[PDB]
RNA sequence: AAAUAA
């Protein structure tokens, strides 16, 4: 499209549950009351959501919401992931995404305490 | 205080470490993902935290924090225990603490795994 | 069995 027309970007970032079994990443990404994710979107000027299987603190509600069929719950069949999104001019859109994907690496490795 | 004004209650509940040596009660109480403790508050309408010496899984981390001197770690000198807390009008609060105190006894017995 | 939930 047009180089100065604002654009919407989106990239699904897989959360490594197969490589780090049993570690609660969702708690780690959000931190206390979500201020580790609030702060991480503010830092990079993107918007981030944790979607997919297990993104919700229960198998059951997340299973029902999933069996409902509504498009808003399409993500709960996909693997657990963070969806980073940005709306800005193209040069800015890709640059912040690139920025955002560098600062998120640390939340996708365990704490070892 | 006043009969329908809300009050705070707290009651330490001791964990029998002398009686079942080396049994991990902390894991039993929190279960997976911390949700057997979390469900036990929802059922009883209380709030619960595990404090005292041995509440943390790293004995040297816990002794740093204990030395550190901050009031938030004062509990790491007391015996290992669950501190049940409630904020409600007196009638409800005492009824919930009691409910919680019967419903907590199951978790103060080891599993023989 | 280890408590962060936007």
Residue numbers in the entry:
A (entry chain C), B (entry chain A): 48 to 160
Wording from the paper:
T-STAR is a tissue-specific STAR protein mainly expressed in the testis and brain3426, and regulates the alternative splicing of CD44, Tra2β, Tau, VGEF and Neurexin pre-mRNAs262728. STAR proteins are defined by the presence of a highly conserved RNA-binding domain, the STAR domain, also responsible for homodimerization, and composed of a central KH (K homology) domain flanked by two highly conserved regions, QUA1 and QUA2. Here, we have determined the X-ray structures of the T-STAR KH domain in its free state, and in complex with AAAUAA; KH-QUA2 in complex with AAUAAU; QUA1-KH in complex with UAAU; and the full STAR domain in complex with AUUAAA. Taken together, our data reveal a unique mode of RNA recognition and dimerization by the STAR proteins Sam68 and T-STAR that is crucial for their function in alternative splicing.
All our structures of T-STAR in complex with RNA display a very similar mode of RNA recognition, and show that the KH domain specifically recognizes three nucleotides with the sequences U1A2A3 or A1A2A3 as illustrated for the structure of T-STAR KH-AAAUAA where one KH domain binds the 5′-AAA and another KH binds the 3′-UAA moieties of the RNA. The RNA lies in the classical KH hydrophobic groove that comprises α-helices 1 and 2, β-strand 2, the GXXG loop and the variable loop4647. The base of the nucleotide A3 is specifically recognized through intermolecular hydrogen bonds with the backbone atoms of I97 in β-strand 2 mimicking a Watson-Crick base pair. The base of the nucleotide A2 is specifically recognized through an intermolecular hydrogen bond to N71 side chain. Finally, the nucleotide A1 or U1 is stabilized by van der Walls contacts to G74, K75 and G78 of helix 1, and A1 is stabilized by a hydrogen bond to the side chain of D158 at the C-terminus of the KH domain. Additional nucleotides located 5′ or 3′ of the (A/U)AA motif are visible in our structures but do not make specific contacts to the protein, suggesting that only the (A/U)AA motif is specifically recognized by T-STAR. All the KH-RNA contacts observed in the X-ray structures are consistent with NMR chemical shift perturbation experiments showing that the residues of T-STAR KH and Sam68 STAR that display the largest chemical shift perturbations upon RNA binding correspond to the residues that contact the RNA in the X-ray structures. A comparison of free and RNA-bound structures of T-STAR show that the presence of the QUA1, QUA2 and the RNA do not induce any global structural changes of the KH domain (backbone RMSD ranging between 0.44 and 1.05 Å).
